[PDB]
Amino acid sequence: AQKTFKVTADSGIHARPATVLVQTASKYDADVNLEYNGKTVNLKSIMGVMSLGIAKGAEITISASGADENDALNALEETMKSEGLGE
């Protein structure tokens, strides 16, 4: 499981929208990561994700290896537009 997006939201990957995405990734057993600028963090980790300081215009990659990896990436893809973060 994997897919790259480009953040559209002016506020980038931060605040409530960032929490929502993290809470989505947490609803799965598969390891969900978030790669950005060569740094990879646990997409289920508030500290890891917000520490990247992802601004508008950046390109991130969401990984997911495990049983529900496919469902994970599917839910996350939904949250990305659902929360208007990127495409």
């Binding site: 605040a15 409530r16 929490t19």
Partner: protein
């Protein structure tokens, strides 16, 4: 049972209400209740609430204040529950805290203004009695000038109180100097709003006659004309990361660094040429 106390100077603050929301969301996420108390920055009140929170058997506390003394530090350490600081400065840096590097951010903002040709740059800070102003933001200002080989002149530093009015007066104060600055950096967005309007009340045009840069990037940055160029502080994130770090402490999970500095950046809008 699963409750953490939150000591904050003023919940009605645009800044603190945002930090508070970030704290609550992660608190909800992790099933923690939140006991909220206002301190108004009164030291006796802060230390008292600290012991009062313990009386309610809280599992941890998130503290926010503009004046952390060695006394606060000791009280934080002796507290039987974990404590995390959010958007606050603790010179000793012993208590786990989450914030950004205020020194660097100010430095970056000033350097930017210098790279643009400014020689007479002014800084409107918050009360100098607060370490974040005198020990962090003012230092970043000093370092930027010194590095650009410019003298540090007190006349180009006005002291505000975070209030919109102080910014109004701050500007009128600075424009009263024999040699006025050509650029002004405010330690806050609300004070930056006052500066812009006071500048316009006196007939000046922003950004034309004066470059203005705020600090925080609160919604207030967009609710001004011209729209304010500002240093970005992931305020909600600070609250979230603070509460999250606290939950790690309360659940004894591995803690990679207790002193966290979230990244900052500058959003240039129309208040700068």
């Amino acid at each position: 049972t699963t409750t953490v106390g939150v000591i904050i100077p003023d919940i009605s603050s645009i800044f603190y209400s945002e930090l508070a929301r970030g704290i609550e969301d992660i608190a909800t996420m992790y099933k923690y209740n939140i006991i909220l108390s206002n301190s108004d920055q009164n030291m006796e009140k802060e230390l008292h609430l600290l012991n009062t929170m313990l009386g309610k058997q809280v599992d941890g506390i998130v503290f926010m204040g503009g004046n952390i003394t060695d006394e606060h530090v000791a009280e934080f350490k002796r507290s039987p529950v974990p404590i995390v600081l959010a958007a606050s400065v603790e010179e000793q840096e012993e208590t786990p805290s989450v914030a950004i590097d205020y020194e660097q951010a100010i430095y970056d903002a000033v350097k930017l203004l210098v790279d643009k040709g400014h020689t007479d740059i002014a800084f409107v800070s918050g009360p100098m009695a607060e370490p974040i102003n005198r020990s962090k933001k003012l230092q970043g200002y000093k370092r930027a000038l010194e590095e650009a080989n410019l003298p540090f002149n007190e006349q180009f530093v006005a002291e505000g109180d975070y209030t919109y009015d102080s910014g109004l007066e701050a500007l009128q104060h600075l424009m009263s100097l024999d040699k006025k600055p050509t650029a002004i950096l405010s330690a806050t967005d609300e004070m930056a709003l006052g500066i812009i309007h006071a500048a316009q009340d006196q007939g000046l045009s922003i950004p034309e006659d004066l470059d203005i840069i705020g600090f925080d990037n609160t919604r207030l940055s967009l609710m001004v004309r011209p729209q304010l160029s500002t240093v970005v502080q992931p305020t909600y994130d600070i609250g979230a990361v603070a509460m999250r770090l606290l939950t790690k402490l309360m659940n004894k999970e591995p803690v990679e660094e207790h002193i966290v500095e979230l990244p900052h950046r500058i959003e240039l809008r129309k208040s700068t040429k």
